[PDB]
Amino acid sequence: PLVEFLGLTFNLSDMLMITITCLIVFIIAVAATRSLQLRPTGMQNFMEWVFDFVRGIINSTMDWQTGGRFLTLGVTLIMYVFVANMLGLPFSVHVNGELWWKSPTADATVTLTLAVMVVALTHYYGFPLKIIEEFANTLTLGLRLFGNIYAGEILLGLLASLGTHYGAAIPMMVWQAFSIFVGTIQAFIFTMLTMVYMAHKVS
Amino acid sequence: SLGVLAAAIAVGLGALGAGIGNGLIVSRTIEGIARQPELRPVLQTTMFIGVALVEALPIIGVVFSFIYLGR
Amino acid sequence: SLGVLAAAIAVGLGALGAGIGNGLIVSRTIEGIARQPELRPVLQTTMFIGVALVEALPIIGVVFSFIYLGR
Amino acid sequence: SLGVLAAAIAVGLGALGAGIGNGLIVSRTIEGIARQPELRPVLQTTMFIGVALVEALPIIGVVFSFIYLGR
Amino acid sequence: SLGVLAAAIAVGLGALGAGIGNGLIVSRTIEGIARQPELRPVLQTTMFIGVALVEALPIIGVVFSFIYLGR
Amino acid sequence: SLGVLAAAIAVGLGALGAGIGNGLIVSRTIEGIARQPELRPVLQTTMFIGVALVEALPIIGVVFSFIYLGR
Amino acid sequence: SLGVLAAAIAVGLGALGAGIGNGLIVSRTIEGIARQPELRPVLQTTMFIGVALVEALPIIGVVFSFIYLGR
Amino acid sequence: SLGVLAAAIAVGLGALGAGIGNGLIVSRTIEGIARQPELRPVLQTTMFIGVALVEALPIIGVVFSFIYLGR
Amino acid sequence: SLGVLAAAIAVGLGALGAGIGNGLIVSRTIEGIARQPELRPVLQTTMFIGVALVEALPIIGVVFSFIYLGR
Amino acid sequence: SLGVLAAAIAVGLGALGAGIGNGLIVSRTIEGIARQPELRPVLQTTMFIGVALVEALPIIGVVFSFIYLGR
Amino acid sequence: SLGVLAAAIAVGLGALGAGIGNGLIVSRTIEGIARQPELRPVLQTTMFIGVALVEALPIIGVVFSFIYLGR
Amino acid sequence: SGGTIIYQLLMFIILLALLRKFAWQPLMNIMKQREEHIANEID
Amino acid sequence: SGGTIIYQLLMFIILLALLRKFAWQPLMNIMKQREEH
């Protein structure tokens, strides 16, 4: 399970998982936003429910006039992190090489650069103790999502090997239901703490 | 040889801290919804928000324990 | 050599964290049902949800203890 | 060598966790039966299932200490 | 060689857990009989079944520390 | 050679557990004294049997510590 | 060799301290928004600056843990 | 040999237990004087006999620490 | 050669103490602003000077850990 | 040699126990003179005798740490 | 040799005890000035003499840590 | 080929089957509650 | 570690703008239209 990199500069498998999660998020977004309907049904009501959910979170943290801009960053951020956490659970394939296609959030560099991208955005829209608190909250957000996905990934993998090598269906079943629970809770706390620091720096 | 019990005390103290923090949060949530049932959805919402926040920093100790077992 | 000691302190600190957290949440739910006895099913269902969410990290400590025992 | 020290530290941490958690549960349920003494069977069944959880994770801790002593 | 220190940490951690548990139980029952004085026999019977209930696992930790001292 | 360390930590953990348990029971039995004066004999009898309960295990610990030092 | 265990106790004690601190803060803000639910933002901002403090000292601890690891 | 740190860890755990127990009981005597300042003699005499009870087992531990240091 | 272990236990215990102290202070001050809102600035200043004290002792602990690892 | 480790440990656990006990007694006397300020001198004087009582034995541990450092 | 981690366990346990006791004192003084605001100078003066009284013993633990490190 | 892939994918499928027997009734009722609420708010 | 950080940063900016323009500024227009309606 080594870091398989075709190029010396960057991990190849992480780029593959970022591309596949971007395409699956984009196609579920355009499948939920096919046509305009004033009476919501099907999946457009689901997309509007996620949209008003993100909006509600923004309304909890800040005034609606200040935080109205962030709604379309926040909904793609929660859906992106949501699908990025749930991709690691079904397949997690092992090839004759090092490793291929685990999940993007299990990579530490992916989650830490997504967290520092979040904080770069909330510095863009917006004394040593304040800046060390800033670097502290960046790295604890990135390490939060990275750890709480990567431990479950390793455990699921361990369970998979224990089952295949030699009766053990329900422990990994209970853990895998708990892991999609961890995925949706981590996506929600990630976008909510994103909007908290956005509200803290805007107003 | 020493990295194994290094990883073990790391994951053990993480489990201890997350257990105490989760216990404090969840116990106060259920006594709060015992005080009144009309706010149990928002108290369960902030319950899971709190459980994530107290189970967040021990799991970075867990994955760092795996790093310690690596070296 | 040190792997069995590693495994044991890992499962022991997991047991300590799960015991303190479960003791807190169960004690507050029984004083909650002592305060208002017609809220017993909601209180004990949220209590079992709390048992799961305080024993999340000790259970993974147990299987990582088996990893530590295996090495 | 280290296996007996492992088994004993697992039993010791499980006993300490079970002691604190069950002490919290039993203490709050006798003050709850001191408040409203007509709720004796509900409080006793809920303290018994809570104690069953708080004991039963150090129970598997103790049998894991037995297989640590065997190794 | 380490079996005596093993039995020692086992009996000591079981003693600390039983001490905190019995302290919680007897403390809350003494404020409970301080509140409602005519509930003294029910509170004492539930207190003694709680004391035996929380020292169940420390005394089996002691009688396992004996065979830890042997092995 | 480590039997002296074994006996010493057994006595120390017994003293720490007995100190916490006696602190809890004496502290809120004098709270019970301070709330109402007339129940001083029944509060003190339950107090001293609680002292017996939280000190008994500790006493066993120090006797077994002398057995450990003899080993 | 011992730098691995040094980094491990550093991250473990930091995780334990951050877990207990975050658990206390989010616990009492659960009961704060349960007593007076219209005070949710004024409780929430002070909650997050407390979370920032109780993580930011174990965060510089876990930043120092890697230079403990290297040596 | 290591009997010196044996004696010292006995002194330290006895001091920790005596400190926590004495702190609890004298703190709640202050709380009881604040609730009702006209029973200061009975509160202080039950305080000092509780201080004797919490202090007794660490003093027994420290005289055994003297017998442990020699060996 | 144990200066890395020295500095790391120093930073870890300072982080644990600062975490528990900051958790207590921030939790009680959000309960203070929760039971009445109109002097949140009065509460916050005394909260920050308490945070300053309970971290200013582990800050000099961290600096002393730096000069421990230097030796 | 290891007597330095002995003395430091005694000093450290004496400081920890004195810190927790003094924190309890001073914190509850803050609450006590906060609720009824007209009583302040008599409860702060019995707070000071409680302070001397809770830190009597850690000073004895400091003197014994001088003895252990001499050995 | 081991005097550096002797110095460090002294500083670490002193910082942990000072953190817990100081957090208790400051938390009770802000809930005291929260529930009645007019006694802020009185409660802050007795809080500052209380925190000086708590951290008196960890500071002499730090200078004893200095003479342990010099050893 | 590895053995873990089809094994955990098969149990992910049967976990979705259990979650289908358990979970299509709540969230479709939540979506129907939102749809009926906003339809009553419109008409 | 790795060097994917500028890759997924630029790809996230591209995906953000592309998604917003192709899906959710029209969804916000539908929401504002039904709010005024």
Author numbering:
A (entry chain a): 6 to 131, 152 to 191, 198 to 234
B (entry chain c1), C (entry chain c2), D (entry chain c3), E (entry chain c4), F (entry chain c5), G (entry chain c0), ...: 2 to 72
L (entry chain b1): 7 to 49
M (entry chain b2): 7 to 43
The authors write:
In the FO region, one copy of subunit b is positioned at a location equivalent to that of the mitochondrial subunit b, while the second copy occupies the position of yeast subunit 8 (mammalian A6L) on the other side of subunit a. The location of the loop between α-helices 3 and 4 of the Bacillus PS3 subunit a suggests that it serves a similar structural role, compensating for the lack of subunit f in bacteria. The Bacillus PS3 ATP synthase structure implies a path for proton translocation through the bacterial complex involving two half-channels similar to the paths described for the mitochondrial and chloroplast enzymes. The cytoplasmic half-channel consists of an aqueous cavity at the interface of subunit a and the c-ring (left). The periplasmic half-channel is formed from a cavity between α-helices 1, 3, 4 and 5 of subunit a, and reaches the c-ring via a gap between α-helices 5 and 6 (right). The channels are wide and hydrophilic, suggesting that water molecules could pass freely through each of the channels before accessing the conserved Glu 56 of the c-subunits. Protonation of the remaining nine subunits in the c-ring returns the first glutamate to subunit a, now into the cytoplasmic half-channel, where it releases its proton to the cytoplasm due to interaction with the positively charged Arg 169 of subunit a.
Adenosine triphosphate (ATP) synthases are multi-subunit protein complexes that use an electrochemical proton motive force across a membrane to make the cell’s supply of ATP from adenosine diphosphate (ADP) and inorganic phosphate (Pi). Proton translocation across the membrane-embedded FO region of the complex occurs via two offset half-channels. The passage of protons causes rotation of a rotor subcomplex, inducing conformational change in the catalytic F1 region to produce ATP while a peripheral stalk subcomplex holds the F1 region stationary relative to the spinning rotor during catalysis. The F1 region consists of subunits α3β3γδε, while the FO region is usually formed by three subunits with the stoichiometry ab2c9-15.
